[PDB]
Design a protein around this nucleic acid. Structure first.
Lengths: 425, 220, 553, 214
RNA sequence: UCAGCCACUUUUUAAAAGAAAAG
DNA sequence: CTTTTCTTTTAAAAAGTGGCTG
């Protein structure tokens, strides 16, 4: 018993047959944190217990979100999401704000709890089933079933949208200057206000959300020593690019002339006049690699010409709402990472990087994980969708640690890859 | 623009509690990053950190004094209070209220202070001083540059003026810092006048204790 | 016996129906047996006569070749099962003693006729229809349908759990101090309660189960010292399994090589380091049931070493969350490792092996982590908290590894041990091209339909070479030709390729591989003091490439 | 309670000189340090935050420096204003602590103390009071020792002193020691003697008298 | 006689990565 | 002036076996 509203019939995408994923191992802490948060929900009957008779399944893990509220269980509904039907509501019903990127500050607000207020289709409830594990497999894992719009499910924001809509109508109305967006269990609020005026209008919003549909957001713990909270805000205007292309040497040797062409010959796909013909001419014979330094000024001229084409508003790019999005990472240096996001290959609509903040959080995975979390966010704020990630790491690996360095309410799609040196220049 | 002035009792009996109030302007105890701190520099020593009142209501006290001291604020009125109970000798000092604020990820310092208030702790009562002329004595005209003296004994309310001849003699005057004697202050100043001047022209030293309302002069 | 616990609504695999298997005329004496048996199961509500409308049927046979007291009459629900709706079995594995805390008073109760106590979905029952074939004479036979969970049915051990666990929760929430480890019909309980006060608590749990309908006789673990739980013998301060009982000489058949090989794995739990790759490779080629393999000598010693590890008695000690877990690793196989998860020095907790190539171009650097990761997750599972590692590699070696590899990798808290055939990266492709060495521009090619092709190269001093080859492909040559360059050259060399494939394989620093060529390329690399590898696009003509291209082609 | 220490207590200098003050921490403070300046008047301005970042208004001459448990504040070319006390502060662990500042005084040529002593006044005596005062005016380095000895060199219990802050003008220091003795001790004793021992000369610059009255 | 755990071996599956071919 | 086909190679998952559990 929760909402006198009538349950909206949800059917899965034809042919598919609901999630049947297995529950990967969880640490004690996480188990407890998961147990607690879980039972208090059965008490409120947000979810019911269920036995073996329910074959379907999806996994859960909880993350230690650094906020003065509590923990956070996270169902990995990426499976059921693709198994689940479409939603004309999630698309046109939820258009995407141009100016979300254009603002000075955008805050992320976990409007998750605005979900318990709506029951899930009785017929559908078998699919959103998860299962808590147990230390050394004492007693068997207790299984639950969702009875209301579940946290992180392609439907929760669709069905609940016409509501979320009215809830913000007052706020978005008395703050036109502000830009609000909805993506999964999150609200992307952005204003051009002074940061202190923003941090005060979010809390302005972070309270209206209360007197209305008891939408409880998280209470974050701010502190003193190394002020991370001061970083929590997001500034999309402050976002840069990556036209760092241009190489530069005085003693141009064979190796350096070849490396430059290899990299420049491939770039011909990402830029117009990438004419590297006269450069090939300089390395005409079986010249001694390591020493020969043909300084030829002949090339110097059109080498500067190619340099020109490498820093400008690329011709060819375009965002097709239709096609997916892709994001590619590469361990580029010391704690430095870079990313390219594209739809139709070799015509990326945005490139950036990731440099671990000054601090003792050195862990190759941890950076990659965090990195992904960043590339994801940019996509949400910019095009309003989520990139699919080709992760430069071993699947078997990333599976052992990604939970321990992930903080978002959402989890994007990802595969694994080992692409050799060209993908770094 | 940004400013904050501290106000206290000035004088408080031992074992009695006191409450300094700091009013401020420009910033606000309602804005995220801001805050205010109470520093304490005891008479002839380094400043000491006591407590920081934080905007998010999460104030922090110095471990040595929280058992007797507390903070709070009324942002609405732009005031910041500091309460300390059962006051002792040692505590008597200038107390500073200071606007602190977390700028960004790594920046955090007390951005702007204020002219501290003087909290004096003592049983002692309002006592007009008694000035005594310190004359050269066993020597006269045996010095081309004769130093004259003027002692100021047994007064409490620390503020005390010492002028030389209705405010004429300034050059060559040293008015030393007061010292605690039987719970009363004793200031001893000194002027040096060329031998030609003192004997011939008059040189009196005047002490003024605003608190008791005593202005007094003394010849030689 | 009959249980009041509510039932699980079981169904059939979507779009099917019940089993309608024929029931062969049985032997006269067989009929008689089944009769008496089912007549008793009837009084025990386990089953009850069905009406002439149930087109459903499962076969019953006679075979009373098992134990003289509750010697059974049997049914084959294989076909029923084949249609019996799928279930989520609910489990992360079988509990291991290394995850048991050291308590004061332990007890291991069990449950007779488990499946024979939990009522089957009354609504589903019409599918357990077994017709006990009547004697030739009587034309109509005797029908029965099960009411509880028939052993042999797929969801019987599942639905039971889900049920037995429930009966347990209400007793558990009322006293979180008594540990109750459950597995089917083996209830393990122990707590800090005095041996007496403990039984005064068993009484309660021993009642609870019976109230719900669970017989717990004295056919349980009586002696405190011995507790034969889950194959393991739980002792006051140790866990063991005396029956290491190996297939003596019967290794006469490949099938017994199976049993042998697998028997080792289990043993590996308490038993310190044991490899099997030698034996495991002997099974590789087999597909014949009942035949033998001419055991490769490599395995004769391996079996000899291992067996010496099988004789000596040992023990695993219980785990206490106060003192933490350390995972020590060791390598002694051509790519095989061992790990000891332990709290205090000599006292071992659980011990395991690791043996595999998670790819084709692996190396002792990769096979380290890939062991570690294989141990954290496995420890996360048995204790809840990640363990500290003691890797047989040096700190610098790891520094250089990850600093180079473009693929992200890591390892949590690891110490530095130095008691093994230390793991380390062999060669090192120099960051910079050696000034004063041959710039061997290499190349290769192979006609798709020729099955053959030529490999070769040219050098900075015009020196050319070429070698046609058969059975090789485009991808094989460019890698093959790389060899010629590495060969025909001293300790210093600059090798220029136009194959992205070659460059990749060679950058990862493979220790070994399954392949011969790729490994030989490694071998040379292990001798040469200075190697450079650089890629150049193939069909544009850059450097000595245009020429080398014309040559090898 | 990270303990903060400013090793150098009072340093000497001159208009133009280069000043660097050292500050040490009880444990690593990850550059969480601020520099506070306090004029002779008694007002505290923020000098720099992050042990390296310049506060606004603050001149360029000022500069942070440090890493870990040690940091330093450096003034390029000293100036008049710049002669003040300096407070080192850390904000790593919350018990915010400042390390007892460093005094930056104006160096001067030495100057012997001009000792001057005065006998008790009848004004005072007419109440039993016998206050013997001995002004030691204008002298270099505060480092100066006084000796109040009455027939027998004993430092009679009852000597209070008050040393002045370095005067802005002369750059000298002047201390005034006041010896307190009752009328019964005033008459009993024979002669009083105030003596200043300074760097000027090993010669203890003394002055005395005798004149019992009541 | 079923269900789960791990370890083995033979296959498929896709696929991504490149490559060649070619018209 | 360019484009579809079809490969070569490598990964990750299915399938009878084995030890062990009940």
């Amino acid at each position: 018993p929760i909402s006198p509203i009538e349950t909206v019939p949800v059917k899965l995408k034809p042919g598919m047959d609901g999630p049947k994923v297995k529950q990967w191992p969880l640490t004690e802490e996480k188990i407890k944190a998961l147990v607690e948060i879980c039972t208090e929900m059965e008490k409120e009957g947000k979810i019911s217990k269920i036995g073996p008779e329910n074959p379907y399944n999806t996994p859960v893990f909880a993350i230690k979100k650094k906020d003065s509220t509590k923990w956070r269980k996270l169902v990995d509904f990426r499976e059921l999401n693709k198994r689940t039907q479409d939603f004309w509501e999630v698309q046109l019903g939820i258009p995407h704000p141009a100016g979300l990127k254009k603002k000075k500050s955008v805050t992320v607000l976990d409007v998750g709890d605005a979900y318990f207020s709506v029951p899930l289709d009785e017929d559908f409830r078998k699919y959103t089933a998860f299962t808590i594990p147990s230390i050394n497999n004492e007693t068997p894992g207790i299984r639950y079933q969702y009875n209301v719009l579940p946290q992180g499910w392609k439907g929760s924001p669709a069905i609940f949208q016409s509501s979320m809509t009215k809830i913000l109508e007052p706020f978005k109305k008395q703050n036109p200057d502000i830009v609000i967006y909805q993506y999964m269990d999150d609200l992307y609020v952005g204003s051009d206000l002074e940061i202190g005026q923003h941090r005060t209008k979010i809390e302005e919003l972070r309270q209206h959300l209360l007197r209305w549909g008891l939408t409880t957001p998280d209470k974050k713990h701010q502190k003193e020593p190394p002020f991370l909270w001061m970083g929590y805000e997001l500034h999309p205007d402050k976002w840069t690019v990556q036209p760092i292309v241009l190489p530069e040497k005085d003693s141009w040797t064979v190796n350096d002339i070849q490396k430059l062409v290899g990299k420049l010959n491939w770039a011909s796909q990402i830029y117009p006049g990438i004419k590297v013909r006269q450069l090939s001419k300089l390395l005409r014979g079986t010249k001694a690699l390591t020493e020969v330094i043909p300084l030829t000024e002949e090339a110097e001229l059109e080498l500067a010409e190619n340099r020109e084409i490498l820093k400008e508003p690329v011709h060819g790019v375009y965002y097709d709402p239709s096609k997916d999005l892709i994001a590619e990472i590469q361990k580029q240096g010391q704690g430095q990472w870079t990313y390219q996001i594209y739809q139709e290959p070799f015509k990326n609509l945005k490139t950036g990087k990731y440099a671990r903040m000054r601090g003792a959080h050195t862990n190759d995975v941890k950076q990659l994980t965090e990195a992904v979390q960043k590339i994801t966010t940019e996509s949400i704020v910019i095009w309003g969708k989520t990139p699919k990630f080709k992760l430069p790491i071993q699947k078997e690996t990333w599976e052992t640690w990604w939970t321990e360095y992930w903080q978002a309410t959402w989890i994007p799609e990802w595969e694994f890859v080992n692409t050799p040196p060209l993908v770094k220049l | 623009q940004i400013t904050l002035k501290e106000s206290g009792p000035g004088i408080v009996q031992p074992s009695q509690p006191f409450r300094l109030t700091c009013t401020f302007s420009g910033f606000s105890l309602s804005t995220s990053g801001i805050g205010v701190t109470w520093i304490r520099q005891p008479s002839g020593k380094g400043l000491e950190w006591l407590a920081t009142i934080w905007w998010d209501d999460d104030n922090r006290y110095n471990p040595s004094l929280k058992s007797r001291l507390t903070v709070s604020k009324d942002t609405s009125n732009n005031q910041a209070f500091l309460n300390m109970m059962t006051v002792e000798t040692a505590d008597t000092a200038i107390y500073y209220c200071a606007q602190s604020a977390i700028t960004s990820v790594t920046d955090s310092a007390m951005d702007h202070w204020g002219q501290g208030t003087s909290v004096t702790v003592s049983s002692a009562a309002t006592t007009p001083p008694s000035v005594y002329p310190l004359a050269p004595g066993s020597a006269a005209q045996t010095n081309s540059m004769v130093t004259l003296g003027c002692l100021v004994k047994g007064y409490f309310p620390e503020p005390v003026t010492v002028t030389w001849n209705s405010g004429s003699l300034s050059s060559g005057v040293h008015t030393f810092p007061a010292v605690l004697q039987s719970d009363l202050y004793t200031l001893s100043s000194s002027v040096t006048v060329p031998s030609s001047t003192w004997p011939s022209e008059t040189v009196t030293c005047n002490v003024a204790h605003p608190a008791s309302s005593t202005k007094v002069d003394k010849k030689i | 016996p009959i249980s009041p616990i509510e039932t699980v609504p079981v169904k059939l695999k979507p779009g099917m129906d019940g089993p309608k298997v024929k029931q062969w005329p049985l032997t006269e004496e067989k009929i008689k047996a089944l009769v008496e048996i089912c007549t008793e199961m009837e009084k025990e509500g386990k089953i009850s006569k069905i009406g002439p409308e149930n087109p459903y049927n499962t076969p019953v046979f006679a075979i009373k070749k098992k134990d003289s007291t509750k010697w059974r009459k049997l049914v084959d629900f294989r076909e029923l099962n084949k249609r019996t709706q799928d279930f989520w079995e609910v489990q992360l594995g079988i509990p291991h003693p290394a995850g048991l805390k050291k308590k004061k008073s332990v007890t291991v109760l069990d449950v007779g006729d488990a499946y024979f106590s939990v009522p089957l979905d009354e609504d589903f029952r019409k599918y357990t229809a077994f017709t006990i074939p009547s004697i030739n004479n009587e034309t109509p036979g005797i029908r029965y349908q099960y009411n509880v969970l028939p052993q042999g049915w797929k969801g019987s051990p599942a639905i039971f759990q889900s049920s037995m666990t429930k009966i347990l929760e209400p007793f558990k929430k009322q006293n979180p101090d008594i540990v109750i480890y459950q597995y089917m019909d083996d209830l393990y309980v122990g707590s800090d309660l005095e041996i007496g006060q403990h039984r005064t608590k068993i009484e309660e749990l021993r009642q609870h189960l019976l109230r719900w309908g669970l017989t717990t006789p004295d056919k349980k673990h009586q002696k405190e010292p011995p507790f034969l739980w889950m194959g393991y013998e739980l002792h006051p301060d140790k866990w063991t399994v005396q029956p290491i009982v190996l297939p003596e000489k019967d290794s006469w058949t490949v099938n017994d090589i199976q049993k042998l090989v697998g028997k080792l794995n289990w043993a590996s739990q308490i038993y310190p380091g044991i490899k099997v790759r030698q034996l495991s490779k002997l099974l590789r080629g087999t597909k014949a049931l009942t035949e033998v393999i001419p055991l490769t000598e490599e395995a004769e010693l391996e079996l000899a070493e291992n067996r010496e590890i099988l004789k000596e008695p040992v023990h695993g000690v219980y785990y206490d969350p106060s003192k933490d877990l350390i995972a020590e690793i060791q390598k002694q196989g051509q790519g095989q490792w061992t790990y000891q998860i332990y709290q205090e020095p000599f006292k071992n907790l659980k011990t395991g092996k690791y043996a595999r190539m998670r790819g084709a171009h692996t190396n002792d650097v990769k096979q380290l982590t890939e062991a570690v990761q294989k141990i954290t997750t496995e420890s996360i599972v048995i204790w809840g908290k990640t363990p500290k590692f003691k890797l047989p590699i040096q700190k610098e070696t790891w520094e250089t590894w990850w600093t180079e590899y473009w693929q992200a990798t890591w390892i949590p808290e690891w110490e530095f041990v130095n008691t093994p055939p230390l793991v380390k990266l062999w060669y090192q492709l120099e960051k910079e091209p050696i000034v004063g060495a041959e710039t061997f521009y290499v190349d290769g090619a192979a006609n798709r339909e020729t099955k053959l092709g030529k490999a070769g190269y040219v050098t900075n001093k015009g020196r050319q070479k070429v070698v046609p080859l058969t059975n090789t492909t485009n991808q094989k040559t460019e890698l093959q030709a790389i060899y010629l360059a590495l060969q025909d050259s001293g300790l210093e060399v600059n090798i220029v390729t136009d194959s992205q494939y070659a460059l990749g394989i060679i950058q990862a620093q493979p220790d070994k591989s399954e392949s011969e060529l790729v490994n030989q390329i490694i071998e040379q690399l292990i001798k040469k003091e200075k190697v450079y590898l650089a890629w150049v696009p193939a069909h544009k003509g850059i450097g000595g490439n245009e020429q080398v291209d014309k040559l090898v082609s | 309670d990270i303990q903060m220490t400013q090793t150098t207590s009072s340093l000497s200098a001159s208009l133009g000189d280069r000043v660097t003050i050292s500050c040490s921490a009880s444990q690593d403070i990850s550059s969480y340090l601020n520099w506070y300046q306090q004029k002779p008047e008694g007002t505290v301005k923020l000098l720099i935050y992050y042990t390296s970042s310049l506060h606004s208004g603050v001149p360029s001459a000022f500069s942070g420096s440090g890493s870990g448990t040690d940091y330093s504040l450096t003034i390029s070319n000293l100036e008049p204003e710049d002669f003040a006390t300096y407070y080192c502060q850390q904000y790593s662990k919350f018990p915010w602590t400042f390390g007892g500042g460093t005094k930056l005084e104006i160096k001067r040529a030495d100057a012997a103390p001009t000792v001057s002593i005065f006998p008790p006044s009848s004004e005072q005596l007419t109440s039993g009071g016998a206050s013997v005062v001995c002004f030691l005016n204008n002298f270099y380095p505060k480092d100066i020792n006084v000796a109040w000895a009455i027939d027998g060199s004993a430092a009679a219990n009852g000597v209070l002193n008050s040393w002045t802050d370095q005067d802005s003008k002369d750059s000298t220091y002047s201390m005034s020691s006041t010896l307190t003795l009752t009328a019964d001790a005033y008459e009993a004793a024979n002669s009083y003697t105030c003596a200043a021992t300074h760097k000027t000369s090993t010669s203890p610059i003394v002055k005395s008298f005798n004149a019992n009255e009541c």
